[PDB]
């Protein structure tokens, strides 16, 4: 079926939980043996969220090459993403090692450091220009260059230096700051405006390594971001945009990391985002300005 009318048909029939459970039943199951080795227990935030062996990102280190991160490679859309958990106190150095080794330009963060009164990830970037961070275990230095705070998100320019070779690179940090502690946003307008800002930066483009995207576990909000981006790109590439099947795309992405999209509410929100985003793309270029306005990002 098409998307927008399949959407109204699930709303009127109130069957989002059943649709989502079907996806869970059909999703791939691949081994994650490296994640479960005892030496890696303090490298995993959640015991039930692990990268598959076949798609996990390897650190270029001979002692322990493990990080909780997966390469999602979308062949028809010609986009790749790295999805990872929020860094832990003992993995912030591994996190920036991965960014360096994979030649990423951008990092997309979809959570706040504290949510629901508990820590959801480490403070892994510097908050003041004059107070840089040094990661001694991986020999990297990280400096805040500039920060632009908007109403729904913040963009930061960061400098990452490999202290071994004295090479430097500019990394862009895209921080969506307004996802609610419970549930999903009422309108997808600010999330879509954010996605378009990441796109406009070059961070998703083939001349760079894959974008690194995370939330707390790296499967829920993170899955919503890459699912919406890939579906919109396929609608632009194909002769028949109504042939894009969001459930089939999600199952393809779940071949590369378990658990993407964590609730039926996140599934419904992903449909909403793709539906509204397809109107702004067209050919309606003006819709982009509309999203920006409706997002009230200023202040």
Ligand X SMILES: Cc1ccc(Sc2ncccc2C(=O)O)cc1
Task: Give me the active site residues, please.
Answer: 215
129-168 residues in contact with ligand X (CB under 6 A) are 145, 157, 159, 168
**Does 170 interact with ligand X (rule: CB under 6 A)?**
yes
Feature table: binding site: 181, 215-221, 262
DSSP 287-299: HHHHHHHHHT---
Secondary structure class of 280 (helix, strand, coil): helix
Dist. CA 133–CA 6, nearest whole Å: 49
**Does 221 interact with ligand X (rule: CB under 6 A)?**
yes
Secondary structure class of 209 (helix, strand, coil): strand
Contacting range for ligand X; rule: CB under 6 A; set: 29-37, 45-53, 61-69, 243-251: 45-53
- CA gyration radius, the chain: 19
Q: Which is nearer to ligand X, 150 or 214 (CB)?
A: 214
**Does 265 interact with ligand X (rule: CB under 6 A)?**
no
Q: Which is nearer to ligand X, 43 or 241 (CB)?
A: 43
Contact status, residue 198 vs residue 81, Cβ threshold 8 Å: no
Feature table: binding site for substrate: 181, 215-221, 262
**Does 198 interact with ligand X (rule: CB under 6 A)?**
no
DSSP 86-139: PPPTTTHHHHHHHHHHTTB-EEEE-S-SEETTEE-S---S-SSTTS-EEETTTT
80-139 residues in contact with ligand X (CB under 6 A) are none
What residues line the site for ligand X (CB under 6 A)? 46, 48-49, 145, 157, 159, 168-170, 216-217, 219-221, 262-263
């Amino acid at each position: 079926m098409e998307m927008e009318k399949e959407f109204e048909q699930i709303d009127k029939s109130g069957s989002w939980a059943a649709i989502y459970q079907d996806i869970r039943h059909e999703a791939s199951d691949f081994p994650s043996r490296v994640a479960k080795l005892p030496k890696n227990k303090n490298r995993n935030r959640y015991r039930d969220v692990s990268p598959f062996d076949h798609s996990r990102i390897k650190l270029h280190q001979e002692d322990n090459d493990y990080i909780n991160a997966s390469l999602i490679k979308m062949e028809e859309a010609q986009r790749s993403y790295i999805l990872t958990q929020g860094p832990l106190p003992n993995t912030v150095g591994h996190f920036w090692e991965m960014v360096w080794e994979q030649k990423s330009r951008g990092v997309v963060m979809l959570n706040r450091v504290m949510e629901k009164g508990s820590l959801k990830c480490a403070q892994y970037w510097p908050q003041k220009e004059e107070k840089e961070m040094i990661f001694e275990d991986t020999n990297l230095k990280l400096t805040l260059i500039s920060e632009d705070i908007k109403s729904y998100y913040t963009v930061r320019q960061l400098e990452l230096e490999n202290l071994t070779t004295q090479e430097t690179r500019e990394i862009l940090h895209f921080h969506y700051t307004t996802w609610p502690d419970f549930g999903v946003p009422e309108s997808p307008a600010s999330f879509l405006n954010f996605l378009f800002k990441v796109r406009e930066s070059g961070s998703l483009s083939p001349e760079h390594g894959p974008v690194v995207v995370h939330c707390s576990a790296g499967i829920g909000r993170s899955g919503t971001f890459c699912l919406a981006d890939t579906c919109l790109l396929l609608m632009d590439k194909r002769k028949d945009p109504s042939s894009v099947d969001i459930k089939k795309v999600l199952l393809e992405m779940r071949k590369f990391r378990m658990g993407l999209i964590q609730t039926a509410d996140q599934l419904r929100f992903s449909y909403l985002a793709v539906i509204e985003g397809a109107k702004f793309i067209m050919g309606d270029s003006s819709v982009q300005d509309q999203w920006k306005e409706l997002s009230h990002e200023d202040l």
